[PDB]
PDB file of C-alpha atoms and ligand atoms in Angstrom:
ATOM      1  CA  UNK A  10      -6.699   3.763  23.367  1.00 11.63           C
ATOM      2  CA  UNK A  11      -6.504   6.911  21.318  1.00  8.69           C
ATOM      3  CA  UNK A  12      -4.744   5.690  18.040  1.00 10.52           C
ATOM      4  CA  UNK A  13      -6.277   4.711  15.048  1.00  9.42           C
ATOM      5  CA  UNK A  14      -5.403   2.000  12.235  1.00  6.47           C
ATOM      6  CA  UNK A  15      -5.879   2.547   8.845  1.00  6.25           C
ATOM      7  CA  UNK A  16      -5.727   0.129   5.697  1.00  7.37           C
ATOM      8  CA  UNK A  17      -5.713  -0.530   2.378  1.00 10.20           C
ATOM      9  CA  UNK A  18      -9.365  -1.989   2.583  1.00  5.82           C
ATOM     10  CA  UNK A  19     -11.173  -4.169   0.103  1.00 10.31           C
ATOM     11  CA  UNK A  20      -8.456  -4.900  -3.019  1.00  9.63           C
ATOM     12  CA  UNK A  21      -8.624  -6.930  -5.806  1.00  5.82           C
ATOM     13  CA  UNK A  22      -4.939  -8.119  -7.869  1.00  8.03           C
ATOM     14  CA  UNK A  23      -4.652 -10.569 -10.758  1.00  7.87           C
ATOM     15  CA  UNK A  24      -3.586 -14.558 -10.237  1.00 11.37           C
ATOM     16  CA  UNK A  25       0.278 -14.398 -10.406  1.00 12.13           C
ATOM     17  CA  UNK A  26       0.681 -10.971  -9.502  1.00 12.34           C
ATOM     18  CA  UNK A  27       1.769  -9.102  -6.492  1.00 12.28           C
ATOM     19  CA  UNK A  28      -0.021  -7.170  -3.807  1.00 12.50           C
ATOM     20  CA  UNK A  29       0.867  -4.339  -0.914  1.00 13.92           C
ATOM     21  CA  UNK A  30      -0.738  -5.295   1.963  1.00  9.54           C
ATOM     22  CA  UNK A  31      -0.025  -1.970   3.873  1.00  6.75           C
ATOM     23  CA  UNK A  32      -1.806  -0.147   6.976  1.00  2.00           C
ATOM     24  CA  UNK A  33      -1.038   2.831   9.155  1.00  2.00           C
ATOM     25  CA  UNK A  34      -1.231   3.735  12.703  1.00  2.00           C
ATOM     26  CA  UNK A  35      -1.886   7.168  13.865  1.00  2.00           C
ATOM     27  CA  UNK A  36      -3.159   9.406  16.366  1.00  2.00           C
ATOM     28  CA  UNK A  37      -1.283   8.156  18.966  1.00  2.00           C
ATOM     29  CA  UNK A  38       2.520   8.179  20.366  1.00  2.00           C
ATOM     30  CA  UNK A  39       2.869   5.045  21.536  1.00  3.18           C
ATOM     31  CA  UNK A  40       5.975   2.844  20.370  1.00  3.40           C
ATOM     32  CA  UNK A  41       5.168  -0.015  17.718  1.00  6.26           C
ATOM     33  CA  UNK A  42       7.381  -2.686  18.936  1.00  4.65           C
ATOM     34  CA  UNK A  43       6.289  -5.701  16.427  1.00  3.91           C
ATOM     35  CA  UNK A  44       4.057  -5.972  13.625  1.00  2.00           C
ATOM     36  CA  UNK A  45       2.403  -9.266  12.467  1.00  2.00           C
ATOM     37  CA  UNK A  46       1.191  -9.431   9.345  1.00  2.00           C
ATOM     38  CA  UNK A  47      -1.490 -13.070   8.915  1.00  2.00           C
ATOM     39  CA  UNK A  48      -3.372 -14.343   6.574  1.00  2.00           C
ATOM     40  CA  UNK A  49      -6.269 -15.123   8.321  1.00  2.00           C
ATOM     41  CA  UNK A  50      -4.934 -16.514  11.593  1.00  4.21           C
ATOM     42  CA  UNK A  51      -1.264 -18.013   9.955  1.00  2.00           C
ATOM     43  CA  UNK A  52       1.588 -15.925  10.225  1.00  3.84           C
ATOM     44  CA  UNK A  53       3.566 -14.300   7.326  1.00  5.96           C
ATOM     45  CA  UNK A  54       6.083 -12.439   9.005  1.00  7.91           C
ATOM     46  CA  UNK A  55       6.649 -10.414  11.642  1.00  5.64           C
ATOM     47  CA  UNK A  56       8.715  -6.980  11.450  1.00  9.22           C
ATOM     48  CA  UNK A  57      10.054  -6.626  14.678  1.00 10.21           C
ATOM     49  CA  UNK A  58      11.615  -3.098  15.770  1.00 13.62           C
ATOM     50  CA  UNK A  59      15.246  -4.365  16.928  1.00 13.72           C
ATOM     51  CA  UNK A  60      15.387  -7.138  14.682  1.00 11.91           C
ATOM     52  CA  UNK A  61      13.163  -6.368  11.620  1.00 11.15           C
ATOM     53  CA  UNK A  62      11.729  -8.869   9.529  1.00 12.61           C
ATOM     54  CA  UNK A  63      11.495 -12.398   9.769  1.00  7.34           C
ATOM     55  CA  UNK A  64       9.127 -14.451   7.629  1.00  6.81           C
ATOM     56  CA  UNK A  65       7.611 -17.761   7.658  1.00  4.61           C
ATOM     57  CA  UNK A  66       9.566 -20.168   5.959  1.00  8.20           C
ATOM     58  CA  UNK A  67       6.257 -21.596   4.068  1.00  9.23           C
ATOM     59  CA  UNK A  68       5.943 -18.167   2.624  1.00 10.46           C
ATOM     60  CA  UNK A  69       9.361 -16.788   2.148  1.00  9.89           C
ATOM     61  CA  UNK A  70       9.747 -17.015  -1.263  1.00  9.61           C
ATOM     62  CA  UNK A  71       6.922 -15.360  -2.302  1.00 10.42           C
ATOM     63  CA  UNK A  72       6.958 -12.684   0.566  1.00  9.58           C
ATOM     64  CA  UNK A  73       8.730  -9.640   0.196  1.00  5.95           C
ATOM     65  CA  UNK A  74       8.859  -7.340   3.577  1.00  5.48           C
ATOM     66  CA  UNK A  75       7.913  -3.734   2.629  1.00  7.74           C
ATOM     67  CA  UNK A  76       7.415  -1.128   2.123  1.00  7.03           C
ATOM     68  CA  UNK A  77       8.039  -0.006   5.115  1.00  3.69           C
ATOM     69  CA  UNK A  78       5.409  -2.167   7.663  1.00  5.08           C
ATOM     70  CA  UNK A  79       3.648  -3.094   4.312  1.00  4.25           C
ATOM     71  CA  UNK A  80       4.081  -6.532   2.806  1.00  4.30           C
ATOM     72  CA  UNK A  81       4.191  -7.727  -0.504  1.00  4.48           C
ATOM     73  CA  UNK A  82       2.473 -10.983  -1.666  1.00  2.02           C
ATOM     74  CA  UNK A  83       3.755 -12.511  -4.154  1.00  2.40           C
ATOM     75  CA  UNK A  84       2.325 -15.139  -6.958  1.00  3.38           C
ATOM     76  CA  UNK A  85      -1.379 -14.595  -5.936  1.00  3.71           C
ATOM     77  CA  UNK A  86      -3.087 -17.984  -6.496  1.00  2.00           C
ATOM     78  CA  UNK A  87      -7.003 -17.711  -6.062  1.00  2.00           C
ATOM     79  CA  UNK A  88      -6.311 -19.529  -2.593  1.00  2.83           C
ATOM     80  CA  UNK A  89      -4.585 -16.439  -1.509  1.00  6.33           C
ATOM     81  CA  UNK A  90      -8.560 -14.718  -1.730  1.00  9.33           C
ATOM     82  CA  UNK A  91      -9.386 -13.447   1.715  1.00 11.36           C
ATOM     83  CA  UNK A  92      -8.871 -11.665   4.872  1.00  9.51           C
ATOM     84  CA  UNK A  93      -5.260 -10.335   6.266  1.00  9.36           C
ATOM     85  CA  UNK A  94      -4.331  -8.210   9.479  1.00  9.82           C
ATOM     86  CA  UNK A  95      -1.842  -6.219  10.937  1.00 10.21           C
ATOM     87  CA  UNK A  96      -1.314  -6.536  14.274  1.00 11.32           C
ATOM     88  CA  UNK A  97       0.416  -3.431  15.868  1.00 13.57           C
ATOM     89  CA  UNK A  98       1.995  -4.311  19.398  1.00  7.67           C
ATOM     90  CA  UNK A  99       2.546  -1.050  20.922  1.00  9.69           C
ATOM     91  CA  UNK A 100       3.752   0.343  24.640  1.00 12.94           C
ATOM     92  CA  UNK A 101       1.827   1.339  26.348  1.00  9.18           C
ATOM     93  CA  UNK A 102      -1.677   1.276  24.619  1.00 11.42           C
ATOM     94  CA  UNK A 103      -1.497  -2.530  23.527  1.00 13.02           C
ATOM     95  CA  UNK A 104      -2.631  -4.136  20.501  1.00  8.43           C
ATOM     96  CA  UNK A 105      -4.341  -2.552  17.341  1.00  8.34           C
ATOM     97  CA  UNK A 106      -5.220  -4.899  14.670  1.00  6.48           C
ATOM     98  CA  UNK A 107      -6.111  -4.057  10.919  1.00  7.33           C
ATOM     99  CA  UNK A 108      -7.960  -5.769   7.857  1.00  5.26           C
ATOM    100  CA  UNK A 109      -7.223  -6.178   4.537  1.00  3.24           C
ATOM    101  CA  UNK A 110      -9.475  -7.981   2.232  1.00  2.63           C
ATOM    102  CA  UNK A 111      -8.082  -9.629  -1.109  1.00  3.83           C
ATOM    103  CA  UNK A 112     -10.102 -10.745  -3.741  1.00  2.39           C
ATOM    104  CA  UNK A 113      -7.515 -12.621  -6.173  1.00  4.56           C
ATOM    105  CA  UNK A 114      -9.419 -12.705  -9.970  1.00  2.00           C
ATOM    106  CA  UNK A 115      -8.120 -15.333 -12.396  1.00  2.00           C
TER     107      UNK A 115
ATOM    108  CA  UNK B  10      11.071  -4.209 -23.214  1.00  2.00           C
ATOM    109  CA  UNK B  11      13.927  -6.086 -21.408  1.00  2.00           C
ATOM    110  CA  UNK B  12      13.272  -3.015 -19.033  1.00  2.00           C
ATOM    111  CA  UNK B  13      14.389  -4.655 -15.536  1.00  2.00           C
ATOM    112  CA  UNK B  14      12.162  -2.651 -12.973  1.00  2.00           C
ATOM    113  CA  UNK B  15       8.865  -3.633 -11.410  1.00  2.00           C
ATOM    114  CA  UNK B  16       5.837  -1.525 -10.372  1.00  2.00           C
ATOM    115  CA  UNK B  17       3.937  -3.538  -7.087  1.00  2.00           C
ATOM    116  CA  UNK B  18       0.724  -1.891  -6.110  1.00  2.00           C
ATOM    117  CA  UNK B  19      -1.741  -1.604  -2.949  1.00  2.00           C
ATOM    118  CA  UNK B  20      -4.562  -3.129  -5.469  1.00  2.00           C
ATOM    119  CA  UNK B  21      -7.859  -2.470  -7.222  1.00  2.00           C
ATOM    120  CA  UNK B  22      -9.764  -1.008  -4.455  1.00  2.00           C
ATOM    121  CA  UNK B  23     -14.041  -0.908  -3.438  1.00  2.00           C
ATOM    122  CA  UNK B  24     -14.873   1.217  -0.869  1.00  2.00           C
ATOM    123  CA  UNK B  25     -18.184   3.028   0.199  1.00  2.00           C
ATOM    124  CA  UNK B  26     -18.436   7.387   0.123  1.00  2.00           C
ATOM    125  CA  UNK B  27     -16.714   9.227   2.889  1.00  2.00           C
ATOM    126  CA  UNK B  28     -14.211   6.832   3.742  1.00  2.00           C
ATOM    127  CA  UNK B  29     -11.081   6.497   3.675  1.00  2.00           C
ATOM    128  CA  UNK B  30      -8.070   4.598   1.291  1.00  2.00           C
ATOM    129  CA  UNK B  31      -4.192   4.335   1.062  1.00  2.00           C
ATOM    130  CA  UNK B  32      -3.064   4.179  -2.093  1.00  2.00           C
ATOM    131  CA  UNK B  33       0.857   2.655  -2.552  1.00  2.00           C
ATOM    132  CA  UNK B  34       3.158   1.329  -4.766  1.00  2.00           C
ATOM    133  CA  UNK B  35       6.870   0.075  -4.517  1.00  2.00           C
ATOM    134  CA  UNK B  36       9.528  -0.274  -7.379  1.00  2.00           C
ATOM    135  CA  UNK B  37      11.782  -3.193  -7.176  1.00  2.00           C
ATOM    136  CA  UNK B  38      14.434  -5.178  -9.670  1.00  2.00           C
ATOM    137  CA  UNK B  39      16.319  -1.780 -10.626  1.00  2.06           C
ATOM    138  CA  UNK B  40      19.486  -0.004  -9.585  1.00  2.33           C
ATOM    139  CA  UNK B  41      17.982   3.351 -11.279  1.00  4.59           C
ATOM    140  CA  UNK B  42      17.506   6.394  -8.866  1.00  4.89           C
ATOM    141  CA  UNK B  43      14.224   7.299  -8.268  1.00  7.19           C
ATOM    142  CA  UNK B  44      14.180  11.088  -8.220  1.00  5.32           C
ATOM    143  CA  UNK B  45      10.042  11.967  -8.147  1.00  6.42           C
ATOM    144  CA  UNK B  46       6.641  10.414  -7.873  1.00  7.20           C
ATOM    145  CA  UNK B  47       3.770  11.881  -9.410  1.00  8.69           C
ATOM    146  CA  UNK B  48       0.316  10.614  -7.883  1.00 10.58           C
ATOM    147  CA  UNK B  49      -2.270  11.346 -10.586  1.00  9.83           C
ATOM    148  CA  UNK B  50      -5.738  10.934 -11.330  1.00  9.67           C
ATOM    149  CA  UNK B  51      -6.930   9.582 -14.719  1.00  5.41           C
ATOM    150  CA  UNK B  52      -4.798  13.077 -16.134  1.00  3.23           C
ATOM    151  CA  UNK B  53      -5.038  15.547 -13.501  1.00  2.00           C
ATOM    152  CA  UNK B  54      -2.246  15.676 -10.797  1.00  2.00           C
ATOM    153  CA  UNK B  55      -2.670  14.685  -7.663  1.00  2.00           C
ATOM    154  CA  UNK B  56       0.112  14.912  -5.114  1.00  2.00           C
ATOM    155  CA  UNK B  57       4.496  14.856  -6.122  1.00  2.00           C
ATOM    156  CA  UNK B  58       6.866  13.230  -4.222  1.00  2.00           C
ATOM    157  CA  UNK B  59      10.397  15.170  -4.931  1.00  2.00           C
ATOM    158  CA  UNK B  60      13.308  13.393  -3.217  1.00  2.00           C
ATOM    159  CA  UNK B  61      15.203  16.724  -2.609  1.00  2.00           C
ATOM    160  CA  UNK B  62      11.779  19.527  -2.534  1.00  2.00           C
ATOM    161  CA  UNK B  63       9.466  16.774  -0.150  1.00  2.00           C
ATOM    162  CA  UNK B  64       5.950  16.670  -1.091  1.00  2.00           C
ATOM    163  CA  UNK B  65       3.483  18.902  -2.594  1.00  2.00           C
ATOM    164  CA  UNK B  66      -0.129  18.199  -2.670  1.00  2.00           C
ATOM    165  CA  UNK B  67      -2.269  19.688  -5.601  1.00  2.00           C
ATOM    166  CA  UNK B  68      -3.965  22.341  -3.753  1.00  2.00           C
ATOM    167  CA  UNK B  69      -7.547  20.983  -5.283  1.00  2.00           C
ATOM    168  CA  UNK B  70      -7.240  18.111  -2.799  1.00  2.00           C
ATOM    169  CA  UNK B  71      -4.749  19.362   0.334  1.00  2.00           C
ATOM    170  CA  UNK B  72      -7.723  19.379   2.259  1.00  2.00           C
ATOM    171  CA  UNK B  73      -8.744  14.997   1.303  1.00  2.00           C
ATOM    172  CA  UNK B  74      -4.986  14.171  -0.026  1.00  2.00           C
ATOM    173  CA  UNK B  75      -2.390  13.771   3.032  1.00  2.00           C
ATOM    174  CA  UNK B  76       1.562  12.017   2.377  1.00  2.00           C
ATOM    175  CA  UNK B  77       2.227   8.748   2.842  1.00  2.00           C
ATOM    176  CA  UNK B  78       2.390   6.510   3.927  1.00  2.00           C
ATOM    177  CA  UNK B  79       5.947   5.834   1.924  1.00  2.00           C
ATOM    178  CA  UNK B  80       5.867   7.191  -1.401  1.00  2.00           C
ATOM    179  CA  UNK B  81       2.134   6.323  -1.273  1.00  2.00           C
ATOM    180  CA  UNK B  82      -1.019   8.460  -0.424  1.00  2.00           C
ATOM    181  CA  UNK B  83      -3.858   8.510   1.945  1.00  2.00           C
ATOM    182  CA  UNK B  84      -7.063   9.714   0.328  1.00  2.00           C
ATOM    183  CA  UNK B  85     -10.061  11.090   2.755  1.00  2.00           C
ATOM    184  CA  UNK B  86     -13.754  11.217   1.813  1.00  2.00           C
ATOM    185  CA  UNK B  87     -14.228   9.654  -0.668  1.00  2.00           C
ATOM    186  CA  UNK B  88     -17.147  10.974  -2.721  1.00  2.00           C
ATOM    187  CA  UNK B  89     -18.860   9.228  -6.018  1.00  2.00           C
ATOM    188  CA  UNK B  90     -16.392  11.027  -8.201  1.00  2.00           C
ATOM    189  CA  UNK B  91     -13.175   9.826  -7.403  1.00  2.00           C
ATOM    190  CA  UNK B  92     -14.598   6.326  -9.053  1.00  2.00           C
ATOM    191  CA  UNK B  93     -11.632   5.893 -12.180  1.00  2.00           C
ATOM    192  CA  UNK B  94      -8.027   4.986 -12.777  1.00  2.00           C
ATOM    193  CA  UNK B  95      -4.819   6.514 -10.438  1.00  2.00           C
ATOM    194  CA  UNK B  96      -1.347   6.341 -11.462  1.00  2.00           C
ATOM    195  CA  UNK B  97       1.941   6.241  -9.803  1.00  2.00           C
ATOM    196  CA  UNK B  98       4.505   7.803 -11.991  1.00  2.00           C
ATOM    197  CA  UNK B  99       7.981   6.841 -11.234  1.00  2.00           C
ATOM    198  CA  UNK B 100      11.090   9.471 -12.239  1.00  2.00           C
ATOM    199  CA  UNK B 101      14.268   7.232 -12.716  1.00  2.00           C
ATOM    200  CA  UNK B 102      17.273   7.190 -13.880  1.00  2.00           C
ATOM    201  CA  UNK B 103      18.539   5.954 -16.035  1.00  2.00           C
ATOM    202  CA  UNK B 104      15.717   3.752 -16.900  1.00  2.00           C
ATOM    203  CA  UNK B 105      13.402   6.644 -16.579  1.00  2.00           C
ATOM    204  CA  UNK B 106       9.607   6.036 -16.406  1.00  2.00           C
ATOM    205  CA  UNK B 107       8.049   3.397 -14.731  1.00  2.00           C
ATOM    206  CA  UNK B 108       4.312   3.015 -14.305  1.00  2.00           C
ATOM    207  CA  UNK B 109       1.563   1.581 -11.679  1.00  2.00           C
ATOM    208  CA  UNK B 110      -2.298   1.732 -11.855  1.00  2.00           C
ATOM    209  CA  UNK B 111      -4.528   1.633  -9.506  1.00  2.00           C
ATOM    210  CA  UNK B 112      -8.570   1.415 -10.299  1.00  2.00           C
ATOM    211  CA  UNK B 113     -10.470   2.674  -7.360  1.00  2.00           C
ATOM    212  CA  UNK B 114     -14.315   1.895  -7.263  1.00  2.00           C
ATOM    213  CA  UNK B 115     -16.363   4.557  -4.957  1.00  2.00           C
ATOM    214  CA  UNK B 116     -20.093   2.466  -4.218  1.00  2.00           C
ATOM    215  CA  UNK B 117     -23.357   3.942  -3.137  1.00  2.00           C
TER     216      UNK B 117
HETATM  217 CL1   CL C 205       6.896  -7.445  20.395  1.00  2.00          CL
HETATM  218 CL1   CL C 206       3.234 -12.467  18.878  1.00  2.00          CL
HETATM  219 CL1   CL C 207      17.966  -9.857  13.281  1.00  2.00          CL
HETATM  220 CL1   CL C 208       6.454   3.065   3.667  1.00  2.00          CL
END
């Protein structure tokens, strides 16, 4: 497994306000086929390559998909404090997984 | 004021030397054209995003500054001294500029 995953490490936004969540694959030719993006081990949307995003309803109207295979939290409440991943599914070399850690100050 | 577009950013980031950070941000709730993005430290220039001449990475940081991902950056080896405030500058128009800020923290 010769790719590697890079992210946006240990961030900190204000209650209310927004947030990227974004990571990067590289160093490897594989196809991405899906991304997940979770908040700790509940889904917030997937972006999948044929049929692009699709959120979960609990979260839709404070997710925005983007940029790109980012995501974009939306109304941070002090709840939203903790760790996300990315999970790249990719042909052939599998699964890479990311982490994000949010810190949400009031 | 009454200005309609919105700056999102990849957050206040703390991360330890010689590693590694993206740094993004995403304009939404405008119509206006972006033409340019300027990445720049707390006044020195960092990296420009053209949308007709591509990129162009000060050449004080081609070798730590690479493009993308998006309009954003990825910023290698991180040393004590990059500790301060970066700025995406958006070009628009007609609106014109629009603003994000990102404070990066560089620990021990
Ligand atoms: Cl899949
Ligand atoms: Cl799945
Ligand atoms: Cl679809
Ligand atoms: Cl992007």
């Amino acid at each position: 497994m010769t790719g590697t995953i890079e992210t946006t490490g240990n961030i900190s936004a204000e209650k209310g306000g927004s947030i990227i969540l974004q990571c990067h694959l590289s160093s490897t030719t594989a196809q991405v086929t899906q991304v997940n993006w979770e908040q700790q081990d509940q889904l917030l949307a997937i972006c999948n390559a044929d049929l692009g995003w699709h959120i979960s309803p609990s979260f839709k109207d404070r997710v925005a998909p983007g940029p790109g295979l980012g995501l974009t939290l939306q109304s941070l409440t002090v709840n939203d404090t903790g760790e996300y991943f990315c999970i790249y599914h990719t042909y052939p070399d599998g699964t890479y997984t990311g982490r994000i850690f949010l810190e949400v100050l009031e």
